Design a protein around this ligand. Structure first.
Ligand SMILES: CC(C)CN(C[C@@H](O)[C@H](Cc1ccccc1)NC(=O)O[C@H]1CO[C@H]2OCC[C@H]21)S(=O)(=O)c1ccc(N)cc1
Lengths: 99, 99
């Protein structure tokens, strides 16, 4: 599909068997989500943004459905005001910026 | 331009006759630049990012030039890790997300 940006590019995702929505974010290297329930082991990570640093759980190689296509990639889990799909997953469903 | 997201989608941008470069960010509604030499008065603004809320200087109706393409809008100045051009400006180039 071809999304414009007169409003937040928000789309459905499925994570942990659960239906959700997230902002398709080209700003960040990695994906972040609202506290959720997930597979296995995570690493501590510190991301930085606007408003300083925030502590996240790094779940590695996780299965997620974005817009209905399967992707396995890194999901960061932490206190994000909103769910954010990073470049890391966007490139696997052939997302590209068009202008 | 169809641009893939393996890298940061950094493009060239011109303000005040200053060449710099900025992230084509679809996760930011607003355009946020670290410093500019714009000549005078700015307006006090608050945006929230992922790590909290920050003071930033709002400039109305700035002529800016992205990839040669001259467009006009509101250019904040703020504590951003990376120059970010958000959707308010990306719509004026008719830029879209695509997959
Ligand atoms: C400036 C960015 C480099 C900061 N981030 C990406 C950015 O998309 C966030 C992502 C984002 C999206 C929605 C809500 C909060 C954060 N948005 C943001 O704060 O940008 C600001 C520009 O204008 C304002 O409009 C919305 C946010 C403000 S980030 O959220 O911190 C970020 C940091 C690390 C990762 N891995 C992924 C994302």
């Amino acid at each position: 599909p071809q999304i414009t940006l007169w409003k937040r590019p928000i789309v459905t995702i499925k994570i942990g068997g659960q239906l959700k929505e997230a902002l398709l974010n080209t700003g960040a290297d990695d994906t972040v989500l609202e506290e959720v329930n997930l597979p296995g082991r995570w690493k501590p990570k510190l991301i930085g943004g606007i408003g300083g640093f925030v502590k996240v759980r790094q779940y590695d190689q996780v299965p997620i459905e974005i817009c209905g296509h399967k992707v396995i990639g890194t999901v960061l889990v932490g206190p994000t005001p909103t769910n954010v799909i990073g470049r890391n997953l966007m490139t696997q469903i052939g997302c590209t910026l068009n202008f």
